[PDB]
Amino acid sequence: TKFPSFSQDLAQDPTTRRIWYGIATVHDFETHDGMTEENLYQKIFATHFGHLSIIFLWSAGHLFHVAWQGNFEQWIQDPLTIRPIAHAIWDPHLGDAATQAFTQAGASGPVDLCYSGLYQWWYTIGMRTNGDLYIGSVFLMIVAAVMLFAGWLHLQPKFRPSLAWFRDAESQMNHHLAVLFGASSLGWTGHLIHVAIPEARGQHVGWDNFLSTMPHPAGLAPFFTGRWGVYAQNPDTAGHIFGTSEGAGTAIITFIGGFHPQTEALWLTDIAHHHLAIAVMYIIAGHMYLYDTYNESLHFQLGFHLAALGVITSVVAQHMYSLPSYAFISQDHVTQAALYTHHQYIAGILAIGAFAHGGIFFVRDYDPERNKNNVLARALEHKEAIISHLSWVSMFSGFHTLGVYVHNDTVVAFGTPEKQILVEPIFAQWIQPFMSQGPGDFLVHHGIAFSLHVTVLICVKGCLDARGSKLMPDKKDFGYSFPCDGPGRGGTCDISAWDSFYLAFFWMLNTIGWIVFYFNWKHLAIWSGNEAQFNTNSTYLMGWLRDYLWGYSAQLINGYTPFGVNSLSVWAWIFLLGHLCWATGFLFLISWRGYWQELIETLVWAHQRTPLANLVTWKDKPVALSIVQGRLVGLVHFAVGYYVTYAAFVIGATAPLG
Amino acid sequence: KGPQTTTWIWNLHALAHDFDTQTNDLEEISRKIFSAHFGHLSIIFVWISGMIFHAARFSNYYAWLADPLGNKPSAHVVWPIVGQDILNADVGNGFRGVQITSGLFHILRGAGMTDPGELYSAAIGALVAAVVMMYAGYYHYHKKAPKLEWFQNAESTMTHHLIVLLGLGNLAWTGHLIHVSLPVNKLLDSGVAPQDIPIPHEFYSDFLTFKGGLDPTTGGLWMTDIAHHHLALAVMYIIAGHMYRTNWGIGHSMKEIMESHKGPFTGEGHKGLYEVLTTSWHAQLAINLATWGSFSIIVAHHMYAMPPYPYLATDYGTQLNLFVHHMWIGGFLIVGGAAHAAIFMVRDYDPAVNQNNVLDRMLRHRDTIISHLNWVCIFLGFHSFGLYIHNDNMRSLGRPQDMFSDTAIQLQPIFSQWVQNLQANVAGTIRAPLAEGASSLAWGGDPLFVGGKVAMQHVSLGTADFMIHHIHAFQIHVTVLILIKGVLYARSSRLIPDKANLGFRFPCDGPGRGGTCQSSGWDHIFLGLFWMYNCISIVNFHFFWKMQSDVWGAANANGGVNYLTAGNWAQSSITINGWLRDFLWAQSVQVINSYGSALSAYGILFLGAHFIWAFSLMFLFSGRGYWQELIESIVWAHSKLKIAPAIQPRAMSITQGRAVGLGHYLLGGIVTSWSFYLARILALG
Amino acid sequence: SDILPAIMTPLVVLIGGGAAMTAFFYYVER
Amino acid sequence: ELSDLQIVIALVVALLPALLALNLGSALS
């Protein structure tokens, strides 16, 4: 059957495997039939415009919805008591009770409270009316229209960029550093100085009056001559109220440091300074400006960029709660928990994605001859060593961390908490925005250490053994994703490199889970004033189960009761949806293909033999999902479940507290 | 032969008891099996001796026997070494020990054992019974192997095991009852001190009734009714055992009866089954384990509803522990029954022997059975679990009027409600006549109170009970689907026509045909065990929550009971959020807050069970592949250091990975529930 | 255009989802 | 606070990327 157009192997599959594998391979452009590197890069090029158009229409939706259905105005008036709103609920299924309960934040009808700090971010960058947002939205739809127009025009042979424009990666690297990053950085400082900071200081800047307005009275005279002094004018008084004349300074570039007290956020002036500095550094480096493999392999490129975006989004999460850059976001606890957990989980996805494409590189692109004695060749030279070391630090950190937590559990249970192995984080004290690191924090840090170790252990045993191993010397033959080599050599289930990404996603979720668990319990403790609770109970595992999971679940799971619904109903329900989704992942992770294939055989029999029903038949012979599809659907359920459950819990834990 | 790979060690432990594999002849096999059965009986005798010994030596038995309501059975003192002294509980009268829940004390009191001499005598008696049963095994295997003919003598063995054991054992026990137990219990109720009661050597409507219900003092069934019941069964079994043909012309020959029974639909009928049953151990183990498991499950229901032993009803901890223990043993045995039905079908099945008999006809329509079970499982799935989902959505959407509940949309379990009225109101003069009262109050009753506690009461049935019942029906059918599918497709399928040849356990027939992972009968038992776990987990939860919301409690000033969970079952058990909140969350408060108390051990086992359970996911979610790759890197690190072992270390078999995954999943899940139950019922009940 | 929700939601979810599922059906079965 | 004129214009604009998405999608197929 035609679909999938690109793969005749599949298109001639007489089964439902053709539809699944189609959708699974529909973006592995490399593997499409008759795909030359030229067309490959051109196709990829156009897809990226599609992606970006999506991101812009996504942002567009944010602004459109908050404008139309939000309470952004009411919130800018009372940003500490008004709950900000994400969008309207129209759902024919809600009962009157649930419409009433979701009728919140002084909204006429049922709404969803926002928890992306979008209100805070927009207030900070200057937006003050629904008009500013509506214009942002319509603008961003038009940007997306342009980006789509672009991908279309580009794939059109008129402007179809040949292999040249892509082979010029070095040019692209320098351009990214300066022409994109640097340029946009200082453009953003433009926005900050002209609109953000004014609107912060109570002065309305529209698009029609900023030509009129000058940011700094001394501005032009300072520009190009004694720029540093004039720019550092009267700094904004602590008295200053955000978006009011009261205590408004005039400085546009400063190094005041710390946080604006009203908003408990980094000074807009400090941010503008930061960005100006970042821009200068980036542009200078641009002007100033494994080679073989990186240019050769697009997998190497993504892998690198994913590991990059991995660390970047991790630091974004780590910094965006410690060093709030948005007004009132520090006070909005649910948003800050949500954003941290969000960005940390996306961090873990981008990280593991790095190692995934790592392994794809090692089975599709890495030629051992091509690079005689490169870093990668040396890495493989002593795989057994890199793995034995990662193994050891894993077994070590693991045995000891679990042992200590279990020791603490045992002695505390036996009613002798004195006997606990409480180790103080001395180096944390030395280094220390920074919150008290106790012996609890120590144990959890080591947990996270161990888990991150086992994750990299797995997703490197993957990318190293991808080429092969004693159990399967020639894996590169069979490729990245394949079921197994059969029950041949004691059994080879899960021997592929894809299987290592699969086995490591679990550890990535465990690791980020420990991270965000620690984050959220610590913060709930402080946000309730019972930081004592964390400090005392975080040292044995029953304390995590009793105080974190058991204790902060109560509100959420009372979201709907036989007595009635409250606003947390939708979260209680999502909480269960995530438990169900997670567990459903176990169906696919534990029950493997053969059981199902026998069962489905019998259903094919029953269908063919049932009068009236037999009148219709499949086009595609029903078959059980593939070995690997079982693993993949398992993992997507497990992951989706994991995320949805925890998202529900993060929201439901923090929301009642505030 | 030689231990070359670490797999050998595992294989040794695995197939050590696979007599069929190790041997070729039914003779040598049956010898091994008989000897072992002796060994095992000795293990049980040791264990029984242990229990009555601990009851004698380290117990509050005598204090309890004096004042049951006051005292809490604790025959389990823990040596104080690492601060585990705390596990010793204030069980009353200053005795400090682990509050036992086996119901041993109730067993002994029912047996009318009041004397420390008597209990030590019983301990040493059972221990010598062990010493002789193990030696009896040695004798009957090493010294004197029995004869194939004796084994195949099923008619003799039936007549014997049915009069000598059932008929005679029931008469024997009724003697022991009416003479020792019944009068001792009468005296103890009258208030004769344990010391005051005479030793055994010192030594019909009055002692045999049909009262029904419970003894309002002890809370148990009238031991008069127990005596009369056991006597009845002695009578019945003496007759029934006389209704077979052993070494004479008198009785029915099983083979005659079997081959008689054919019909239109069942073709040649049972012709050939006697042959397979006699020639195949596995066929016997299958039928037996299936009925033995089914028996433990009937035990669970019967012992909670008609609490036999004195004061058991009031002892909520034992009533729960026994229902849950027996349910577990039931499910595990039923599944091993299916297992051995599959091992039979793979090994001990001859197409020669079974030819158009009921077994062959089963295999010949096995797609209609699997297909229909598939259907009934989807159906029940949706119309049980989907009704809870429905309710979760309706209740969360604030449309309680749209829910399935006693209020709003109502699914009354009318068949069951009807049977309940028909057992509560129909006391006397229907079918079996002259019953003074109902067999139990469960059918219909006002709460019998022994002390503050409700011994037993009307176990109501509403929408919550219709729903959870269909949940049970659903999960039992899925477990049957998995098991009957593993039995009927153990030989072959459309996917693998030579499965019989691949064996009972094989990991798969490799990645082709789309993938054949877990296609063996063994793999079907693997999956069946997860469904038996899910099934019995929900049965044990249904019990726990229904009991502690609708039956158990304390009588306050007013007639009303102070139910343990205050009747939230009716309204809270009809949603999954209901269960998460008002059962697992609400009721885990004891086990999570158990640290630094008597019950701290249940807290620790709650956590450790969560850990063993999660850890098993390592085995179930991963494959031998990754592990052998990693193992060989680790071996390279032992090779560098010249520590590399003689026995090459091999990642466990695919099947072993699965079996330990499952073992840890089951151990973790079961122990988790166990911790939760014990902490909650020891603390609260 | 307060009602635009009550139109856009069924249109997109029911009508668009239907049309999408129909189209994807044709697409993977032709 | 957001007027119907504005809601409509937003929709009409959003229709443009819709057409162009159809176009680009077709291309990439």
Ligand code: CL7
């Ligand atoms: C016209 C501008 C507009 C945009 C850009 C937009 N919405 Mg809405 N939109 C919703 C989500 C949404 C998302 C996730 C999203 C982000 O892209 C957007 N929207 C974006 C839901 C909250 C709600 C659902 C009902 C429903 O979806 O309403 C129809 C929405 C339409 C006409 C906007 C279409 C434009 C989007 C840019 C398309 C995005 C495509 C995507 C990038 C491609 C990848 C697909 C992906 C699945 C992989 C909704 C509403 C709704 C409306 C209306 C009028 C809109 N919208 C309007 C818009 C409802 O009445 C109605 C509302 O009032 O509900 C009360």
Ligand code: CL7
């Ligand atoms: C998750 C880690 C990961 C990341 C972050 C990542 N990849 Mg890969 N990646 C690709 C590119 C890519 C890009 C451009 C990119 C951008 O950053 C990434 N990747 C990133 C292509 C080269 C290639 C094509 C992949 C492929 O062809 O994509 C088609 C697959 C699709 C259409 C189906 C995907 C469905 C989602 C899984 C589940 C979504 C759930 C959803 C939320 C619903 C929830 C319901 C509700 C409750 C919310 C690819 C590979 C592949 C893999 C793997 C494992 C990955 N990846 C992994 C990752 C292939 O094997 C595979 C491969 O073929 O290796 C041989």
Ligand code: CL7
């Ligand atoms: C789990 C369901 C089950 C039950 C209840 C059951 N069997 Mg089988 N069973 C046997 C008999 C038998 C008897 C006499 C019997 C009595 O009740 C049962 N079974 C019962 C033997 C004929 C035969 C071999 C027996 C043989 O393998 O048994 C030897 C003993 C073994 C390896 C130890 C297993 C250890 C458990 C994993 C841990 C349980 C301990 C406890 C919970 C607490 C934990 C300890 C703590 C430290 C944490 C057999 C088969 C086999 C299987 C399977 C799957 C089963 N079974 C299954 C069951 C073969 O593969 C296997 C076979 O190879 O196929 C033929």
Ligand SMILES: C=Cc1c(C)c2cc3nc(c4c5[nH]c(cc6nc(cc1[nH]2)C(C)=C6CC)c(C)c5C(=O)[C@@H]4C(=O)OC)[C@@H](CCC(=O)OC/C=C(\C)CCC[C@H](C)CCC[C@H](C)CCCC(C)C)[C@@H]3C
């Ligand atoms: C509670 C959940 C869980 C645990 C405890 C666990 C345990 C571990 N996983 C390991 C690895 C992995 N796990 C993997 C996939 C998974 N693992 C999962 C879930 C877990 N896995 C899941 C869901 C997956 C997806 C399939 C992979 C892919 C790997 C590895 O490569 C990695 C590994 O092997 O590294 C070398 C090890 C990482 C720590 C280490 O190296 O030594 C530390 C050991 C620890 C922390 C547990 C030790 C348990 C105790 C201390 C042992 C003694 C306990 C008793 C005394 C034993 C006797 C009991 C008898 C008396 C009855 C360790 C054995």
Ligand SMILES: C=Cc1c(C)c2cc3nc(c4c5[nH]c(cc6nc(cc1[nH]2)C(C)=C6CC)c(C)c5C(=O)[C@@H]4C(=O)OC)[C@@H](CCC(=O)OC/C=C(\C)CCC[C@H](C)CCC[C@H](C)CCCC(C)C)[C@@H]3C
């Ligand atoms: C929450 C965990 C979980 C779920 C939901 C699940 C689901 C099910 N397992 C089944 C079977 C099995 N599961 C097996 C192994 C396992 N199953 C596991 C875990 C699960 N398995 C695990 C962990 C294992 C490993 C041992 C086996 C070996 C079998 C079976 O043979 C058996 C089967 O297939 O029988 C035919 C099915 C029972 C028959 C049925 O169709 O009921 C009906 C479906 C139910 C109860 C699931 C949810 C249905 C609810 C009501 C949603 C309604 C649908 C709505 C309209 C939602 C649609 C939304 C769209 C519009 C987007 C069913 C699909």
Ligand SMILES: CC1=C(C/C=C(\C)CCC[C@H](C)CCC[C@H](C)CCCC(C)C)C(=O)c2ccccc2C1=O
């Ligand atoms: C449950 C299960 C199945 C059976 C599940 C199957 C076959 C998927 C069932 C079909 C789902 C419900 C969707 C298919 C029907 C949709 C209606 C298709 C719509 C899309 C069409 C246009 C193509 C497996 O095949 C399997 C394979 C390997 C490991 C584990 C498992 C496993 O757990």
Ligand SMILES: CC1=C(C/C=C(\C)CCC[C@H](C)CCC[C@H](C)CCCC(C)C)C(=O)c2ccccc2C1=O
């Ligand atoms: C972890 C894991 C392993 C590896 C686990 C192994 C090899 C367990 C065996 C090692 C344990 C520790 C046995 C003990 C070994 C010796 C007894 C060592 C001596 C111990 C003394 C200190 C007492 C598998 O082999 C496997 C196979 C198939 C599916 C999943 C998995 C799986 O998950």
Ligand code: SF4
């Ligand atoms: S994936 Fe399945 S088929 Fe392949 S080795 Fe593992 S069990 Fe055998």
